[PDB]
DNA sequence: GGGCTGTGTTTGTATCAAGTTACCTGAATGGTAGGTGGGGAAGTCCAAATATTCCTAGTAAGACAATTGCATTCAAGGCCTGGCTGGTGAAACCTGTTTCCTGGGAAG
């Protein structure tokens, strides 16, 4: 168990999988905070809130990558229409109990 | 002559600290190898200190004049002291919450 645990296997994983597009809009979301960028107007991150039926971008900048700013971030664009699912990554702010 | 407040002396216990230690880790030491910093010796040049006089300006002084400063008296106001009332501050009790509090940890 000293060389289980450094050599890395020579298998590759196999086909990627093509999940389906949705069939309607706010279906899915796939939300991820970029930046920090070079700063302008005090703001660092831009959510990004692409639909997963078209490709239709939202952006809301905030401050700092926390959960209430993307709580606030949403409320604009949850005036709008309501998804059913919305994807991320295990993100630190999206991870919260309080997210 | 008397009085008031500060002061002192003695006791008990609670609290605070003194005590000794157990460990356990943090840190404190020992032995070493390396390079670097600094310390030391030197020199041409550099800046200040002196010896001088000279002249001049203001320093020093003597006189005078008048204001100010001082010392006293006057007048009363302001503040200190105390007899009193009560509203809050503090000490003891209880806690939930909040924040930290480094510390570790995950994830983008
Ligand atoms: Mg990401």
């Known amino acids: ?3 289980l645990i450094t050599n890395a296997s020579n298998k590759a994983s196999g086909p990627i ?3 389906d597009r949705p069939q309607k ?10 930046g920090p960028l070079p700063p ?7 959510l990004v809130v692409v639909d997963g039926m078209t490709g ?3 952006l809301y900048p ?9 709580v606030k971030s949403l409320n604009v664009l949850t ?3 309501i998804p059913k699912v919305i994807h991320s ?7 919260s109990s309080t997210f």
């Open 62 to 70: 905030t401050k700092a990558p926390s959960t209430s700013a993307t």
């Open 89 to 95: 990554d295990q993100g630190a702010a999206f991870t």
């Open 56 to 58: 239709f971008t939202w």
């Open 40 to 46: 302008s107007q005090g703001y660092l991150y831009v």
């Open 25 to 34: 809009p706010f279906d899915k979301f796939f939300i991820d905070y970029i």
């Open 79 to 81: 005036s709008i229409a």
């Open 1 to 3: 168990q000293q060389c």
């Open 17 to 19: 999988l093509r999940p």
